[PDB]
Amino acid sequence: IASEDARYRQSSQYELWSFSPSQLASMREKTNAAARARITERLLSPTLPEFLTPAEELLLVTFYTAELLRAGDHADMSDEIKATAATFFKRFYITNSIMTYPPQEMLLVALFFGCKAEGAFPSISDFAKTFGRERPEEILAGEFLLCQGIRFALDVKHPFRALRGAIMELSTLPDVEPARLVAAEQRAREILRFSPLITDAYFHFTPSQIMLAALSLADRGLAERLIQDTFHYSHVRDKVLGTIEACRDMLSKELPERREHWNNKTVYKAQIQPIRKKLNKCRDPDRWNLVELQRIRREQASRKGFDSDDEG
Amino acid sequence: PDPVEQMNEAEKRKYIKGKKLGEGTYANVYLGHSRDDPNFKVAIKKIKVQAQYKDGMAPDAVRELKYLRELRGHPNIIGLISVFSSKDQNLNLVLEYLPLGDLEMLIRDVERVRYGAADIKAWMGMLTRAVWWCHENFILHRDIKPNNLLIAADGEVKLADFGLARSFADPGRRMTANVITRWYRPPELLFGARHYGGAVDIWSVGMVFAELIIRSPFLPGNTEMEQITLICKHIGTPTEENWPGVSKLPEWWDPMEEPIPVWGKDAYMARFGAVGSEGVDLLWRTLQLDPKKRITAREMLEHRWWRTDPKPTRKEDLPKKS
Amino acid sequence: DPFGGMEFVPSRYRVREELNHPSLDKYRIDQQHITGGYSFLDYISRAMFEAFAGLAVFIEDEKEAG
Numbered sequence: 207i208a209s210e211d212a213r214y215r216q217s218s219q220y221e222l223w224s225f226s227p228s229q230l231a232s233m234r235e236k237t238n239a240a241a242r243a244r245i246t247e248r249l250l251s252p253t254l255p256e257f258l259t260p261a262e263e264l265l266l267v268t269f270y271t272a273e274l275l276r277a278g279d280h281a282d283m284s285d286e287i288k289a290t291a292a293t294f295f296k297r298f299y300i301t302n303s304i305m306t307y308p309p310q311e312m313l314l315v316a317l318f319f320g321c322k323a324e325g326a327f328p329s330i331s332d333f334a335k336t337f338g339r340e341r342p343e344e345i346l347a348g349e350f351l352l353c354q355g356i357r358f359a360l361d362v363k364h365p366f367r368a369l370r371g372a373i374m375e376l377s378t379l380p381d382v383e384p385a386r387l388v389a390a391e392q393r394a395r396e397i398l399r400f401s402p403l404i405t406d407a408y409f410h411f412t413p414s415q416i417m418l419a420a421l422s423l424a425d426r427g428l429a430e431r432l433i434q435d436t437f438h439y440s441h442v443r444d445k446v447l448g449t450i451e452a453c454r455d456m457l458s459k460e461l462p463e464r465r466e467h468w469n470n471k472t473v474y475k476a477q478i479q480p481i482r483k484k485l486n487k488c489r490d491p492d493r494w495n496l497v498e499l500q501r502i503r504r505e506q507a508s509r510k511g512f513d514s515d516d517e518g
Numbered sequence: 519p520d521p522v523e524q525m526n527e528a529e530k531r532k533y534i535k536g537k538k539l540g541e542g543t544y545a546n547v548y549l550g551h552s553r554d555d556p557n558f559k560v561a562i563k564k565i566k567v568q569a570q571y572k573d574g575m576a577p578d579a580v581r582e583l584k585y586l587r588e589l590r591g592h593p594n595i596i597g598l599i600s601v602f603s604s605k606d607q608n609l610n611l612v613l614e615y616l617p618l619g620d621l622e623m624l625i626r627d628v629e630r631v632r633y634g635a636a637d638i639k640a641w642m643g644m645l646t647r648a649v650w651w652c653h654e655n656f657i658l659h660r661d662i663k664p665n666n667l668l669i670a671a672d673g674e675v676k677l678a679d680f681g682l683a684r685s686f687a688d689p690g691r692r693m694t695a696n697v698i699t700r701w702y703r704p705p706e707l708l709f710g711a712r713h714y715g716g717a718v719d720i721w722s723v724g725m726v727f728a729e730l731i732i733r734s735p736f737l738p739g740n741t742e743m744e745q746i747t748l749i750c751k752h753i754g755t756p757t758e759e760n761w762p763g764v765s766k767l768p769e770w771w772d773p774m775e776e777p778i779p780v781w782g783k784d785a786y787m788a789r790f791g792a793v794g795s796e797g798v799d800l801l802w803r804t805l806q807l808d809p810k811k812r813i814t815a816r817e818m819l820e821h822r823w824w825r826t827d828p829k830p831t832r833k834e835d836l837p838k839k840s
Numbered sequence: 841d842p843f844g845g846m847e848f849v850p851s852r853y854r855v856r857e858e859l860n861h862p863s864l865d866k867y868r869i870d871q872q873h874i875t876g877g878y879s880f881l882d883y884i885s886r887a888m889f890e891a892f893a894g895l896a897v898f899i900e901d902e903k904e905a906g
């Protein structure tokens with residue numbers, strides 16, 4: 207019944223991109239099934255290829271999310287922008303299938319649109335330059351598409367500033383020691399920069415909950431102390447602690463060290479490459495080329511039936 | 519055949535499009551009405567691509583799409599009812615229907631539109647509540663002016679143009695100094711300030727306030743130097759005494775004439791006394807050179823002017839355009 | 841009610857004067873931040889709100905109940 211809880215429940219993140227694990231699983235499975243059905247119907251127009259499993263889709267989504275984060279670190283981008291880009295990526299590929307649009311391109315598309323969503327509107331040419339992309343249009347061709355995928359929700363909430371605020375709140379306690387707080391803040395911030403972005407943390411937990419989970423991972427004592435202080439001054443306390451513990455475990459399953467796991471060449475060759483070959487043989491033939499999709503949609507919007515280049 | 523595409527088409531079918539109300543360089547507005555309730559009217563703003571911009575989606579489009587959703591729910595902010603993509607790969611915003619124009623056309627129509635102190639008080643209350651709701655959610659508007667204050671059917675004023683908005687920047691995060699129309703830009707932005715706060719908006723509000731009283735732009739400079747000179751002339755010359763560090767702003771400039779002492783409350787009474795002493799006080803508090811001493815939106819809503827007679831006009835009784 | 845019944849009053853936290861962070865010290869004395877009107881109070885309030893906003897929002901149960 208807290209006012210801040212209501213104001214958070216009024217956000218687009220909660221009403222549009224916050225579900226239960228079962229709902230998210232069913233959505234991903236249905237999206238994969240719809241992609242398979244559409245590509246199968248299109249192909250017959252005959253030996254069909256082997257389509258990706260929902261698990262394989264999720265594995266590729268996680269790998270390319272980690273690669274997007276590495277790219278953002280290479281571009282010296284702000285934490286908020288990197289988190290927004292990763293969230294846009296995950297949302298687009300929860301509403302769209304990996305077999306429909308190429309993630310290798312949607313990664314850069316999400317980084318660009320996240321820059322825009324965080325108030326930074328760079329020149330597309332400078333962006334492509336910094337990412338060694340020769341044709342900048344290859345990025346623009348996905349922009350509006352990505353906008354549709356995330357269902358036009360551009361306001362994404364992150365727990366970094368919440369972490370700093372919680373550290374400030376703990377600083378007022380006279381028993382806590384400054385060095386311990388500094389170490390805890392550093393570790394919790396290092397966690398927030400990777401763990402909640404590679405897992406489904408944003409989908410099942412609140413920025414405050416994710417921040418408290420990262421802190422509990424950095425120093426459980428301080429997080430438990432903060433919760434005890436807030437609730438000393440009931441059932442809600444136990445439920446909050448349980449949610450924080452669930453988020454803590456979901457995060458611990460993918461700690462920042464696992465970065466080296468998602469950039470490992472052996473892990474790539476063993477777990478990633480087969481999936482990419484299967485995708486290269488089962489991908490959507492019409493929707494994969496974003497530049498051509500954009501061209502044909504422009505020509506359909508302008509030229510209705512006055513065509514002079516169609517030969518049959 | 520895409521699921522998201524058919525979902526967008528289902529959302530687009532929810533509203534029937536009608537007459538074209540306006541043709542703008544930024545977007546085209548059509549009248550519309552809900553399919554389930556044809557009595558429920560709505561405005562469909564279809565954002566037309568700007569051929570001049572080669573960097574993809576325009577910043578004003580993204581900014582509106584983000585912040586209109588963030589702020590929706592307040593009576594004095596234009597309501598973003600829905601968003602959907604059209605078949606021609608364009609953006610469409612289904613918004614509140616505000617047929618009574620804006621506040622600029624009411625102010626300018628001096629021959630036919632008559633309003634008094636209570637009306638200015640009600641309008642300023644609406645504007646101040648809108649800006650307070652903006653800042654309460656950590657959003658700067660940075661383009662507050664009369665023509666961006668639309669009027670609903672019942673007379674409630676809504677802040678509309680969010681193409682220049684921005685979230686509150688963190689410490690050390692630089693912001694643009696090129697925001698807010700020249701006539702309504704605060705002195706710190708003219709000086710190129712890169713780390714400012716909500717005060718920048720309050721200044722614009724003040725400049726709206728003043729414009730409501732004299733029914734003409736207060737400081738209508740044609741160049742940035744003209745704006746600085748007008749602020750020095752009619753408000754006061756900024757100096758290290760009243761504004762520590764002003765001479766160190768990235769683009770600080772002074773016409774190098776005899777400095778003008780900052781005018782006090784009484785100095786305004788001669789021109790703006792139409793709103794009464796208490797009212798003028800508020801005006802003065804919104805027009806402080808140092809943004810640190812500039813009144814805040816919360817402080818503004820708590821000012822004594824609102825409860826001072828005469829009471830503000832009921833929105834149902836506000837002046838309408840002819 | 842001057843805020844039109846929309847006044848935000850936090851429930852589980854309060855923004856007091858003693859709140860501060862050492863990383864802010866280097867900016868609070870930066871000429872541009874003070875002379876340009878940057879609000880550290882607003883930043884502190886935003887940080888606290890985001891740290892406590894939605895603390896009791898149980899996504900799984902609330903979404904499965906709908």
Ligand SMILES: Nc1ncnc2c1ncn2[C@@H]1O[C@H](COP(=O)(O)OP(=O)(O)OP(O)(O)=S)[C@@H](O)[C@H]1O
Binds near residue numbers: 540542544563613668
């Ligand atoms: N609820 C509404 N919101 C916005 N515009 C409306 C609304 N209802 C009617 N209109 C009409 O929309 C027109 C203005 O559309 P806008 O999209 O705001 O373009 P504009 O801002 O006038 O053009 P620019 O880009 O500033 S030169 C006016 O002619 C109004 O009659």
Ligand SMILES: [Cl-]
Binds near residue numbers: 631
């Ligand atoms: Cl008059």
Ligand SMILES: [Mg+2]
Binds near residue numbers: 679
């Ligand atoms: Mg306009």
